[PDB]
């Protein structure tokens, strides 16, 4: 909000704050901004006019960055998180690092443990090496260094590591997010044979991706978040049966759920997850997810100290499951009495023609 | 509406009792279009926040005491009217006209001296 | 083309290089030899064909592109000139600022052109020196 | 970014800047924009200043020499260059140099010159 | 209430944070002028800068005197978002859409009944004119009885 | 290459020498003098047929210009579409200029053509911000679009028109652009939000801001007063002395 | 609709002919219907074409006509001694139709009145080659290379080492579209 | 006295509605109830556009249909407009040219020609006969230009596909010529005040002599298609039919007025340039349809090619520049080396030439109707007001009066026999 920002080094920026064309002076490096939540925290960034360079793996996948930005403003990168000349020279101009990097799932070439660990050693070792400022890691909720969830587990680890090197560390700890573009409403939405192990019984407290993207603006722009923990979560508490009745409520979908035991759905979980190569929303450590509810961590500061309210699901699901709405003139409700006589004034038929 | 479906030749207030007659006909049609406004455009507000915002955009010219001026001002909201009823202007020429939805947000001249000075005039 | 022009040309360059004309030009072709880039692309004249084909060109690389022309020839397979470079005394200039090798299009690689300010910022401002209390 | 010798030097024929508002390179070509880049691609033109001072003196007997930069309408607008004064008049469009023969002694004296002078 | 910045007017879709706060903007009740910057189309911003009406003075380069025949209304520049630095290119960026924008006009008064039309603040600035005094060629060669003072060298 | 045998090279064929090339200097303005009398004759025609319009005319060359009273239009129109001597049954445009140094902002121009005489005539109104006009969409269909345009351009504003909707602008433009007080760039910009998945109208900001180089207009006055050319018809006469 | 004075000679149209006053006999009425015979003479017309030479050039390989007054992308241009021909007037700036060129001039170490800034905006240009028919010493021209399409248009900033670096590459075919339309310029 | 008297509205401005007037009723040419004669019937609306030829870009145009047929056309046009006529204020007069290339995309050196002929008749030169003739060929190259576009892409929207290849390899050598006097294949630039640019080059006329030899045997093949077809006619006849008084009454000018009967161009009523020197004729129609104007558009490509052949064998040597340094520039060669030469070149580069107050409007027969332009000039160097009136835009608000009742297969022809490109629409 202020035209002066001194870094957490000393150095002095003199900001401009208006939009693409203006001199936000902030540069800045965001590792994971080609998925979901990424692409918020970028866009907020390059359009107040701050340079966001967007390591990236994939290069179609990041051609739709650019346009959130002037020219000489979103800089693409081509990295791996096992290469570590292209971290260490994505990091070294910038002032705030962002990680978002995270799977849920394990692949034929990171686990858990390769993603989660050995990229944020990976990653926050260049963040010390080069003196950055801010260095924000993006953890996920319930993370927890003694964890039956690899993702809980090695989520929690990667804090640790995060502080152990660089102590100025935020970390923020994000509950399931919601919105476009988002796995939360859209499977619901989308999938119709849907598998679990717990009745759809998980209780959470889900949160918009846009005041995320919007938090993660803040902790830039406030030097005081720097070094402790957030817990970004919703106002209201949420089970997925309650969570997809909401859906449910506006879509008029019908779906499958299957509902099979844990012991017989796990081993199975792995196996398919092991031989389908895209994302098939159910895998090992997925399942076990499942049996876990969040547990808000209340040592851990808020949106209300970052000046934010969160909003709830229910606001929101007419707005992003609109799309979703098969509605013709077959599915309109039985005629009234009043206008079948508004039909006796036309002829619904052209018999000239 | 020979030409158009909310067509209206361009006509000049005869007097007061004439040209407040259109203003509240203009009204009227307005708030009452609210409903069809807030489907068609998928507007992200209540229909309440849609008409209370449309009361504004007559509060602003409620102390014109000149009938020249009136009729431009009427002219001006009949042709936003027909542009609005026909599906031509776009949700975003639409949902741009709600001072909220700009990332800077309805707070965009400061608020006092102290605040605009501490940011450089906001 | 027609069989009479690709038949007298087979009986020419010979059926090697039939094919490897078919795998980048698409046509059976024959002419005189004008010269060699730098880049060493070759080309051919020849007065008999229709109007626009007299000129062509054997490119160097596999991965052919038509910045991979030399400048002076440029201008002779465009038509613009009717001499080509190895007549020309335009290109007998001693510059030894002069390219020593032909660079092309270098865009869509690690080489691209990067614009940048070539000048001085405007304002300088005070380097604080505080005096001794 | 610095490793590279043409990331460094102002032009390949001359290391520093010659004017007080240019850019060094180095400074140039700092930053995120230059990271995986490759500098030896980057357009380097040779400076015009260090080639101009390469240039031999025309000696003349004359007051005033005429200068068309060299290729009749392919030059410059033609103007006039007095040689009068004991140093090597310079064409203000091209920088060819220009010397009275009566200043050659002069000339031939001075420890170091604008000019080859040869 | 006496030149007090009105902080509460409401903001239109080209209000930026380089908008200065305005004091007045036309309400369309005002004697004798036609509101017109109520029923213009343009921002509000346009009710909050001053313009300042003048006529051009002569170069001090050259003695034509053509430009300095017709009052011109420009905009005042503002503290901030007239001019910063492009960091790509080194150009130089505006936010100020008044910036290139000049109206010319015969008389003062046509001057100052279109910037009360449409609402603007503006400062007149009166004329600098000459005093004529009568000059001599003879005077360059007058005969001075004592001591020279001077040695006129044409 | 077959050659026609018949159609020789005509380039090969040699030129006879072109060698002093003499030109007389013309004024272009001199072969209007002898329609001078008649256009100034047919304006004199048309103001005292019309006195309770027509205000003035003016000649330049082969131009006839007519200045009326803006509530006289639905009449000069009329005589000058359903008369036997101003068969003038085309309108050819119609725009307006904006002179903010006059009360009345605007300056309505017509442009008119008479297929029947081979002539035209131009027809000059005024307007204002507040003031309308009357639309003579009512003689010339072909009217109807050019009003639009003159009002989504300027504002002025066409009592009697069907439909006086914008033509040219976007749907929710604020402003009237050939305004002189309008600058070049507007106030407002558009893009694509990808937070908000549409596009999104912002202020606006130029990456390079315009320059104008209006600065360097000539310090002299470069056309001068011109010369007189009214027909001696049309001047009053000179007392002879004594 | 006509020109006054007396109509034209023969204006009005004759009276229509009667069905039975036409001049056609019904054996060839009836045989151009069912025979089609004006749609075959057309069908015909593209067999002809079919056994005419092609127009198509094969680019990259072969290239199209262009002429020495070509516009293509833009250079600056050296003397034959090495020194820039650019004196920074800036008469090219002040022409530009788009406002694509931007200069910043300063005395050189040397004295020399010479640009430190020469950006030109591709994506602003119009190509009119204003730009070269302004200059007094033939600094700035538009070679006759049109290929270079670019992936960024960050690439399409020209500054002005990449300018010379286009004339030192370009020069020998710069000097010769030159010396071809000199006489004309 | 407005805008006071208009305060309380005192006065009201008489609108034409007043002025109405009964009809003579003696010399006057041509409800309820159970029946279905008075049940209504509901139309529904149509979003024609964009087609596939470049020069319909774009075009919104909605229609409201009973059925098949149209009831009324309401085209949404502004998708083009770029502001060119403010941006004009803002340019020298020089500087501006290149606006007028951009405004009818097919036919720019008739553009640029009204242009100069504006400029230069405020300026109140008279411009060499070299350029005269220069001016009035390139008209003509131009005009066969425009009518190879609006001819072929018509009957490739109509269906015809092969006339519209073969006439643009004409149209690829004719462009030629366009980058041989000047560098651009589209935007020349080259007709300006004054005359023309450069000099045309020394094998030029010999190459559009070879050119005119057998550009008449293209427009006889691309006859042989469409003329006699019975498809080609049985789809333009009695479509988009406008009278001859309606046509004046709509602003109607070129063929859509030549069309329907009214004997009128403005290159023999006005005569510009080399026009009056050179003999051709005029097509006018009958029966004011689509197959009349494409029958009056086939006659004036040999029209204009027997202008082409004529100007080939009367151009006459000489400037092809006003002998005029205060307006048009001097050549390089004096610039390098005459002191006046470089001052005027140096201030017609950077200030540009006053042109003398005053305002004119000047009319040429541009190919796709009369196009205009009203210039006011305040005897400085800038225009103070450009204005352009484009032959299009009036033909496509008389397209609801002529598409009425008509099929939507019917429309499309109708777009296309209005020589229609929309940055000349859009201005
Ligand atoms: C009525 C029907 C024709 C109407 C169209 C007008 C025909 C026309 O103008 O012909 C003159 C025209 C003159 O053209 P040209 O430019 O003088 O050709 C000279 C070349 O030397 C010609 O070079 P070329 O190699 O083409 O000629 C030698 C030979 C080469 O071809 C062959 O020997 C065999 C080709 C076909 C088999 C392989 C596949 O071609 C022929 O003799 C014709 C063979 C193909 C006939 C059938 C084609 C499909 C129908 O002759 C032809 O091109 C074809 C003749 C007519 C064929 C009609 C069937
Ligand atoms: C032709 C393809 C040849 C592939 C060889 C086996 C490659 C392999 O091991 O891929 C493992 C992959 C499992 O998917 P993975 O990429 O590990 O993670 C993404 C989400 N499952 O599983 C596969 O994609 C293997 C099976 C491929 C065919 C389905
Ligand atoms: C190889 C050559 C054939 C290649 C394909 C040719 C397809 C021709 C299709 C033409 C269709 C024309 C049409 O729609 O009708 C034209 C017309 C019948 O319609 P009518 O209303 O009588 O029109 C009178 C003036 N033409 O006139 C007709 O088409 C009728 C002609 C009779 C059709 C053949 C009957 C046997 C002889
Ligand atoms: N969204 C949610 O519901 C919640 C998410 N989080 C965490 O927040 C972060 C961002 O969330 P979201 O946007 O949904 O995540 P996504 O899965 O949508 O995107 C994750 C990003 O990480 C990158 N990435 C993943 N694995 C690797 C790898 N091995 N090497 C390099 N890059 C990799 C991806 O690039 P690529 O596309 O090329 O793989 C992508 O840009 C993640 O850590 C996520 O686990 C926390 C709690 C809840
Ligand atoms: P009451 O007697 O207290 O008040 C009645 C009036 C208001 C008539 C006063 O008595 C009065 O005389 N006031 C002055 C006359 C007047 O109000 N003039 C202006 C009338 S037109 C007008 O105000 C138009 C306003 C804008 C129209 C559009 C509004 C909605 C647009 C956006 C909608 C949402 C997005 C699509
Ligand atoms: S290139 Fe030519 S016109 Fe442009 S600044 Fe240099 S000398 Fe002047
Ligand atoms: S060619 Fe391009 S750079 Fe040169 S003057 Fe024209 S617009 Fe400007
Ligand atoms: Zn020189």
Not at chain 3, 51 to 71: C, F, Q, S
Request: glycine share 6%.
């Amino acid at each position: 909000i202020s035209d002066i920002h001194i870094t957490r080094t000393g150095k002095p920026l003199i900001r401009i704050q208006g939009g693409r064309s203006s001199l936000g002076e902030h540069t800045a490096t965001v590792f994971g901004a080609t998925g979901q939540l990424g692409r918020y925290i970028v866009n907020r960034l390059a359009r107040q006019g701050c340079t966001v360079i967007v390591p990236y793996r994939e290069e179609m996948a990041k051609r739709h960055l650019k346009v959130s930005g002037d020219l000489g403003r979103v800089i693409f990168m081509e990295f791996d998180l096992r290469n570590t000349q292209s971290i260490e020279e994505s990091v070294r101009h910038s002032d705030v690092v962002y990680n978002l990097i995270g799977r849920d799932y394990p692949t034929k070439n990171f686990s858990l443990a390769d993603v989660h660990i050995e990229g944020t050693e990976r990653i926050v070792e260049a963040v010390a090496k080069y003196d950055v400022d801010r260095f924000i890691q993006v953890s996920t909720y319930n993370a927890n260094p003694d964890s039956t969830c690899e993702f809980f587990r090695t989520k929690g680890i990667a804090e640790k590591v995060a502080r152990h090197v660089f102590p100025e560390t935020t970390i923020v700890r994000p509950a399931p997010m919601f919105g476009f573009e988002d796995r939360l409403l859209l499977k619901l939405a989308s999938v119709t044979n849907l598998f679990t192990s717990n009745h759809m019984r998980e209780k959470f407290w889900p949160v918009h991706v846009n005041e995320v993207g919007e938090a993660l603006e803040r902790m830039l722009y406030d030097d005081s978040t720097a070094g402790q923990t957030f817990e970004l979560y919703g106002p209201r508490q949420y089970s997925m049966a309650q969570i997809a009745e909401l859906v449910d409520r506006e879509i008029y979908k019908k779906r499958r759920h299957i509902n099979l035991p844990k012991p017989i759905l796990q081993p199975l979980a792995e196996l398919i997850n092991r031989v389908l190569w895209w994302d098939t929303g159910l895998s090992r450590d997925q399942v076990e997810r499942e049996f876990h509810d969040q547990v808000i961590d209340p040592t851990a500061k808020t949106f209300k100290d970052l000046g934010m309210e969160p909003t709830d699901i229910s606001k929101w699901t007419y707005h992003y499951l609109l799309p979703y709405r098969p509605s013709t003139y077959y599915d309109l409700p039985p005629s009234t009495e009043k206008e079948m006589r508004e039909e006796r004034k036309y002829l619904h038929v052209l018999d000239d023609q | 509406v020979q030409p158009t479906k909310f067509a209206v030749t361009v006509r000049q207030s005869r007097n007061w009792a004439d040209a407040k007659q259109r203003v509240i006909a203009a009204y009227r049609a307005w708030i009452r279009a609210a409903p069809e406004i807030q489907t068609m455009y998928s507007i992200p507000f209540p229909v309440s926040h849609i008409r209370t915002r449309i009361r504004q955009e007559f509060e602003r010219h409620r102390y014109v005491n000149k009938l020249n001026v009136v009729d431009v001002l009427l002219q001006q909201s009949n042709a936003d009217f027909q542009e609005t009823m026909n599906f031509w202007r776009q949700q975003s020429h639409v949902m741009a006209f709600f001072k909220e939805e700009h990332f800077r947000g309805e707070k965009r001249l400061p608020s006092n001296f102290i605040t605009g000075f501490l940011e450089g005039r906001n | 083309s027609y069989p009479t022009r690709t038949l007298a040309n087979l009986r020419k360059i010979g059926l090697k290089e039939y094919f490897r004309q078919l795998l980048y030009i698409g046509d059976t072709k024959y002419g005189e030899l004008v010269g060699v880039d730098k880049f060493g692309n070759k080309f051919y004249e020849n007065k008999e064909e229709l109007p626009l084909r007299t000129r062509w060109v054997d490119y160097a690389k596999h991965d052919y592109d038509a910045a991979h022309i030399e400048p002076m020839w440029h201008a002779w397979i465009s038509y613009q000139v009717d001499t080509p470079p190895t007549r020309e005394p335009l290109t007998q200039i001693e510059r030894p600022w002069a390219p020593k090798e032909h660079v092309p299009n270098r865009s869509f690689t690690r080489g691209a052109y990067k614009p940048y300010n070539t000048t001085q910022p405007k304002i300088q401002s005070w380097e604080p020196k505080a005096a001794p209390r | 970014t610095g490793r590279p010798a043409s990331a460094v030097m102002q032009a390949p024929n001359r290391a520093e800047v010659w004017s007080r508002s240019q850019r060094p390179r180095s400074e140039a070509m700092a930053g995120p924009r230059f990271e995986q880049t490759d500098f030896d691609a980057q357009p380097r033109p040779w400076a015009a200043i260090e080639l101009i001072h390469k240039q031999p003196v025309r000696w003349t007997h004359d007051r005033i020499v005429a200068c068309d930069g060299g290729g009749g309408p392919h030059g410059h607008p033609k103007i006039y260059i007095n040689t009068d004064k004991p140093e090597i008049a310079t064409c203000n469009y091209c920088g060819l140099p220009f010397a009275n023969e009566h200043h050659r002694k002069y000339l031939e004296s001075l420890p170091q010159t604008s000019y080859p002078l040869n | 209430p006496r030149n007090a910045p009105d902080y509460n007017v409401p903001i239109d879709i080209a209000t930026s944070t380089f908008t200065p706060v305005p004091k007045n903007v036309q309400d369309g009740s005002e004697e004798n002028v036609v509101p017109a910057g109520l029923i213009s189309g343009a921002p509000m911003e346009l009710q909050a800068r001053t313009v300042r009406i003048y006529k051009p003075a002569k170069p001090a380069t050259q003695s034509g005197e053509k430009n300095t025949q017709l009052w011109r209304m420009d905009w005042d520049v503002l503290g901030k978002g007239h001019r910063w630095e492009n960091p790509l290119m080194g150009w130089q960026s505006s936010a100020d859409f008044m910036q290139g924008t000049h109206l010319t006009f015969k008389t003062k008064e046509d001057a100052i009944a279109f910037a009360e039309k449409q609402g603007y603040e503006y400062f007149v600035q009166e004329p600098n004119e000459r005093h004529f005094r009568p000059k001599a060629y003879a005077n360059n060669f007058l005969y001075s009885p004592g001591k020279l003072k001077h040695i006129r060298t044409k | 290459v077959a050659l026609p045998k018949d159609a020789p090279n005509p380039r090969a064929i040699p030129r006879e020498p072109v060698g002093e090339i003499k030109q007389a200097l013309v004024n272009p303005a001199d072969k209007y003098q002898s329609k001078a009398d008649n256009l100034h004759k047919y304006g004199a025609w048309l103001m005292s047929c019309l006195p309770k319009y027509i205000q003035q005319f003016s000649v330049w060359k082969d131009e006839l210009t007519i200045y009326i009273c803006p509530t006289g239009v639905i009449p000069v129109f009329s005589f000058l579409k359903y008369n036997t001597n101003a068969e003038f049954t085309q309108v050819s445009d119609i725009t307006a200029v904006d002179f903010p140094t006059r009360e009345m902002r605007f300056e309505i121009v017509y442009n008119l053509l008479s297929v029947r005489h081979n002539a035209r005539i131009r027809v000059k109104t005024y307007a204002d911000e507040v003031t309308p006009v009357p639309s003579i969409t009512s003689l010339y269909m072909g009217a109807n679009w050019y009003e639009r345009e003159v009002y989504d351009m300027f504002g002025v504003l066409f009592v009697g028109h069907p439909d006086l909707r914008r033509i040219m602008t976007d749907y929710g433009f604020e402003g009237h652009p050939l305004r002189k007080d309008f600058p070049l760039t507007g106030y407002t910009e558009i893009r694509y939000d990808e937070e908000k998945k549409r596009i999104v109208v912002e202020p606006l900001e130029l990456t390079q801001a315009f320059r104008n180089f209006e600065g360097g207009s000539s310090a002299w006055d470069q056309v001068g007063p011109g010369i007189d050319r009214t027909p001696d018809t049309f001047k009053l006469p000179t007392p002879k002395p004594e | 609709a006509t020109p006054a004075g007396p109509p034209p000679k023969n204006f009005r149209l004759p009276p229509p002919k009667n069905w039975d006053e036409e001049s056609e006999s019904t054996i060839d009425k009836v045989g151009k219907y069912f025979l089609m015979t004006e749609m075959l003479r057309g069908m015909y017309v593209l067999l002809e074409q079919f056994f005419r030479p092609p127009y198509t050039i094969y680019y990259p390989f072969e290239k199209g006509p262009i002429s020495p007054r070509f516009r293509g992308e833009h250079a600056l241009r050296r003397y034959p001694s090495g020194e820039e021909r650019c004196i920074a007037c800036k008469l090219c700036e002040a022409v530009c139709p788009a406002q694509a060129i931007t200069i910043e001039a300063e005395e050189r170490a040397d004295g020399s009145r010479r640009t430190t800034r020469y950006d030109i905006d591709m994506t602003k240009c119009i190509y009119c080659g204003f730009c070269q028919e302004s200059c007094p010493v033939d600094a700035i021209v538009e070679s006759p290379n049109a290929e270079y399409a670019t992936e960024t248009r960050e690439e399409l900033l020209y500054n002005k080492e990449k300018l010379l670096a286009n004339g030192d590459k370009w020069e020998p075919e710069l000097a010769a579209a030159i010396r071809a339309d000199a006489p004309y310029r | 006295a407005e805008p006071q008297d208009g305060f309380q509205g005192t006065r009201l401005i008489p609108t034409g509605a007043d002025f109405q007037s009964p009809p003579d009723p003696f010399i006057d040419e041509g409800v309820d109830e159970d029946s279905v004669e008075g049940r209504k019937v509901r139309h529904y609306t149509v979003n024609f556009g964009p087609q596939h030829p470049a020069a319909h870009g774009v075009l919104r145009l909605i229609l409201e249909l009973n059925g098949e047929e149209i009831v009324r056309a309401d085209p949404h046009v502004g998708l083009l407009h770029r502001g060119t006529e403010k941006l004009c204020e803002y340019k020298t007069y020089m500087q501006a040219l290149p606006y007028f290339d951009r405004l009818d995309y097919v036919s720019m050196m008739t553009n640029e020609q009204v242009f100069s002929l504006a400029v230069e008749k405020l300026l109140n030169i008279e411009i060499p006969p070299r350029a005269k003739f220069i001016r009035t060929m390139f008209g003509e190259i131009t005009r066969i230009l425009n009518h190879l576009m609006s001819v072929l892409s018509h009957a490739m929207d109509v269906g015809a596909l092969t006339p519209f290849l073969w006439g643009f390899e004409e149209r690829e050598k004719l462009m030629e010529f366009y980058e041989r006097v000047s560098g651009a294949r589209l935007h020349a630039a080259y007709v300006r005040p004054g005359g023309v640019h450069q000099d045309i080059p020394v094998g030029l006329l010999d190459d559009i002599y070879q050119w005119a030899t057998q550009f008449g045997d293209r427009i006889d093949e691309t006859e042989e298609m469409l003329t006699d077809n019975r498809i080609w006619i049985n789809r333009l006849k009695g479509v988009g039919v406008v009278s001859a008084a309606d046509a004046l009454n709509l602003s109607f000018t070129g063929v859509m007025l030549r069309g329907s009967g009214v004997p009128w161009d403005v290159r023999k009523s006005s005569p510009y340039d080399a026009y009056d020197q050179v003999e051709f004729d005029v097509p006018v129609g009958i029966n004011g349809d689509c197959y009349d104007r494409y029958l009056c558009r086939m006659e004036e490509f040999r029209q204009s090619l027997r202008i082409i052949h004529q100007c080939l064998n009367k151009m006459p040597a000489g400037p092809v520049r006003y002998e005029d340094y205060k307006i048009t520039p001097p050549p390089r060669a004096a610039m390098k080396e005459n002191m006046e030469a470089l001052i005027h070149h140096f201030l017609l580069f950077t200030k540009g030439y006053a042109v003398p107050p005053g305002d004119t409007y000047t009319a040429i027969e541009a190919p796709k109707g009369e196009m205009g332009v009203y210039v006011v000039s305040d005897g400085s160097e800038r225009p103070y007001r450009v204005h352009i009136r484009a032959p299009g835009f009036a033909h496509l608000s008389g397209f609801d009066h002529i598409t009425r009742g008509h099929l939507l297969a019917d429309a499309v022809a109708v777009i296309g026999t209005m020589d229609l490109v929309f940055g000349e629409v859009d201005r």
